[PDB]
Amino acid sequence: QSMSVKGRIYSILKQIGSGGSSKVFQVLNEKKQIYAIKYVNLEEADNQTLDSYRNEIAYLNKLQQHSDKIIRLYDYEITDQYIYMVMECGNIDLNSWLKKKKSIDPWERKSYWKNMLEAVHTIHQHGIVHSDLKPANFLIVDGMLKLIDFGIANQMQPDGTVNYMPPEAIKDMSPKSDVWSLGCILYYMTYGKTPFQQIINQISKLHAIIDPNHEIEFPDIPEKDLQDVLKCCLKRDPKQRISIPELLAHPYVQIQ
């Protein structure tokens, strides 16, 4: 099975993932170079569903020039029936990697952290708040971490969770909400668990996040700056919580 995106032929090598209507494939061009293609079937898409892909494409396009911690979009094809998207091919997503990885090197964590911050910082600069951030939204490319999506459209799975939810999101039922989410992703790469992985019942966990009388665990580790990073990020009151630019000037990032 082959395909043509803007008069350019791409041979299929494998299918990376399938989500909903959309499918993702490991593909090759005339020069045998590798790309990922997100195919989307628009045959049964609603007016709303259609708008979410138009938005995700636009944001992905504007942000290219701004940061290199955003996945490169080379070309696209949007008809009434389908969407083809030619993007750069990563090695693995952070979630699949973290599960495989087990224990992680402190120096790789520091770098993955600087990338995650630089990426989320850029989406904020364009007035975008991701809201629901997870290790999956991140992709390892060239020994680098790059954001795959902005939350705006449908997520995918290779071929969801509640542990990364900010208390303010659960209360009202801000960019600081993504600090809490990145905080959970770092806490995980530091302790092997998310702050509320220990609460089995989802109704119970959602209440442990919003409850200040419930203290989140913070064990002693050789990295002092990393321990403080975690305390700053996981502050329940959004106004008390650290910001991405304040994190970008923190010794954990700027000193080694």
Ligand SMILES: Cc1ncc(-c2ccc(Nc3cc4c(cn3)cc(-c3cnn(C)c3)n4C(=O)OC(C)C)cc2)n1C
């Ligand atoms: C064990 C395992 N499970 C899944 C993987 C795996 C392997 C390679 C990749 N590479 C990859 C995945 C990609 C992209 C580019 N490269 C681009 C995308 C993409 C799709 N929509 N948007 C907005 C971006 N993408 C993607 O969605 O990957 C999914 C499967 C995690 C991603 C995941 N691996 C190695």
